[PDB]
Amino acid sequence: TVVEAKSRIAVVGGGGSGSVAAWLLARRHDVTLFEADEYLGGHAYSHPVETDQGTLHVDMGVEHFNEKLSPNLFRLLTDFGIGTYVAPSSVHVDFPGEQQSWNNLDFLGELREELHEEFDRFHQEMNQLPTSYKQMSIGEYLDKHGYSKSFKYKAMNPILSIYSGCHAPSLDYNLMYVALSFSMNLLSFFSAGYWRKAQGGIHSYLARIESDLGERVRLNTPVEAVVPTQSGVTVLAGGQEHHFDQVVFATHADVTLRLLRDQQYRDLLGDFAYVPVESVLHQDESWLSPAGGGAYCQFRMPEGFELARAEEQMGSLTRNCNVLHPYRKVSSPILITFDPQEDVDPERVIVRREWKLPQLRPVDVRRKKRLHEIQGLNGLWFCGTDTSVTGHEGAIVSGMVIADRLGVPHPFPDDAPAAAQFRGIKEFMGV
């Protein structure tokens, strides 16, 4: 397929992937970016919180990345003159009994006493692993390598749930992803992980992308349908018909399919599994740990847990924002509880967000790769979290891959690691 310059190209979905694709495609082509909600970024949302220090753009979805893991995102932020800061992944885990806890800052707690030897063995086994087990599950490994049910549900499951989704079948996800998160110091039982945050919310780089695009962006304009035709492609958005030569989808595969209007498409876009996530921005200081109230990530398992019913019981993850270095002078509590099990005072709740995260079982990964088939067929292209590897870097680099295929080359060839990532994703996507 040959795509001429100055073509009319639409971008459906304006999250991180859409926005990057739209922004690079604004060079070379005439682009329009359709976004259902009142802002750019989607999972990258920074909610304004009023405080004594000013207005804070509090990250409720996407929060963390770093310069090793996310090179392209890092250069992008740099060039936009956006600073990053270190937000170490300090973790404290609370369970029902007296002193029934553990943390990655000190060696205190009954669970630490009960489990230290397994935390220690785990780190060794994880590190020796990347160097069978090709697509294995973390749960299968734990069982086959004699780890206690206590480690499985009191250590493994909570740590995995500091992201990776609480509702998610965390113990079923790919072994290599856990082995890598541990070797790369993203998760650890002995130290806080090396995580970075963007200066003045993650939205900062999107807010710039938004200005740079200007009139090309349609906020509050949900697409209703994308109909490829003999002539070109027809987009029905915000009660109007639009004529384009190409259409780029940066929406979740389920949304992509509902908007697309062949049953090869139903095969490749249907069956994509998701996990509900509820981010709750609140100020109810009763969620803070009485012993670990100084750690960034605080996990709490409610009363009547019962280790035998462990698959049924679920804990809640709170994020102590006041522990973030920019929020040090701020006097008002800033908490984020994901999927709260116990109650959260409605009087103290700033806002709630309801999102869906893709599952990461090797089958889901196998599904993603297969999309290479419908790429650049009937003037359609697919990018986003569902077409790429996990994380923000994965999403925004996927948008870069599609933009590159439409004659806008990778913006940072100079940056060796950023070029390597792009080469990786382009290869993963089969584009």
Next chain:
Amino acid sequence: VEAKSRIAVVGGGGSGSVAAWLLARRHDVTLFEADEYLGGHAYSHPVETDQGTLHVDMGVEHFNEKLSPNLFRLLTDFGIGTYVAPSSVHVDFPGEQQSWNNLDFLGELREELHEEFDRFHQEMNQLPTSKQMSIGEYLDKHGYSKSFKYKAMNPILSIYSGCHAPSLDYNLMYVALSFSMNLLSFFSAGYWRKAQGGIHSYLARIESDLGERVRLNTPVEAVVPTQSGVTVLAGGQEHHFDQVVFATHADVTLRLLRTSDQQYRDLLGDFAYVPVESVLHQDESWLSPAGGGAYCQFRMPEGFELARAEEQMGSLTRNCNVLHPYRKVSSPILITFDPQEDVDPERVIVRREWKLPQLRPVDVRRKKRLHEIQGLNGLWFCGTDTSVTGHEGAIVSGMVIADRLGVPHPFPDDAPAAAQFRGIKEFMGV
């Protein structure tokens, strides 16, 4: 070099011992050791406590499975366990609340320097993927404060370079790598492992495995390559060998060597060292009043002058009671390296005097050049001075020499251990 040859090993530290142990296979080896034990820098001193006798690591104590694969397999095969001893660091300076640590964000120095600690980590991480300059030159060219240089950079580097060392003159890549690999960090404790029951445990085993091939308290006096073979003068006796392997520091190697070739002085002279004094004591007045929970505690004495900063050195204490096996103990276990202030003689268990090599790019360039005199006049060189830094660097150079003498790398199966060996063998130019 034919099999069943008579080979001597001068120096019985980690490198010697590993080389001797692998060379016991294929050849008839003798291991000469000046001191009463095997290991040298790897020393574990017995300390009596209510819970038991502890083999307290006073020299070499840190490694991990990523950094030290060969050392790790060696320990495993000998049935020796390892534990996590995170590199928690607290830095104390003369004023009120004039400190910083890698566990929390408290302290005046933390307030004064947070932005630079943060910038540093980014710059370090982006660097190996981008420099034969010093850490000091980099710091200066990249606008870092003299406060950062002497109150943050210099103390953190102290953990393994020694409070004395012109640490700021050491190569940049060594710092860039120590930071990217989470060995040193201003935001988290480093992933460091310790051997269970002291580091000596693996040496104590090689000692048994060698038996009568080991000659302790037998300092070599001279190594004279002859027309016939080589002649070793050790403990007032003449010994006849076909090959001689030196696992002693280059300065010691030269003093022992008697060759009449100027080149030897060129390659072995000019090697720079740094004195280190390890002090195993129980004087709790060395613990930080604020950071007494961190593993590595640095203290700069009163009258520090930021302008005279090159002249003043601080002292590094190691809070052993923070180690997980030492958690039930009730007697303080401290190790102060190069104490500036007075340490109570009533509370001093023992002292050790050692010398560490300098790691300026010139020193690194010297090490590589030794490839010239290797396997000449029936002599071979291994050790800390012929290899990259650390215990792995040391024992793997002993393995490289053993492999050159027909004893192949013992762990080809272990992919990372094979890769390290391939690396060192290449670095050494052997």
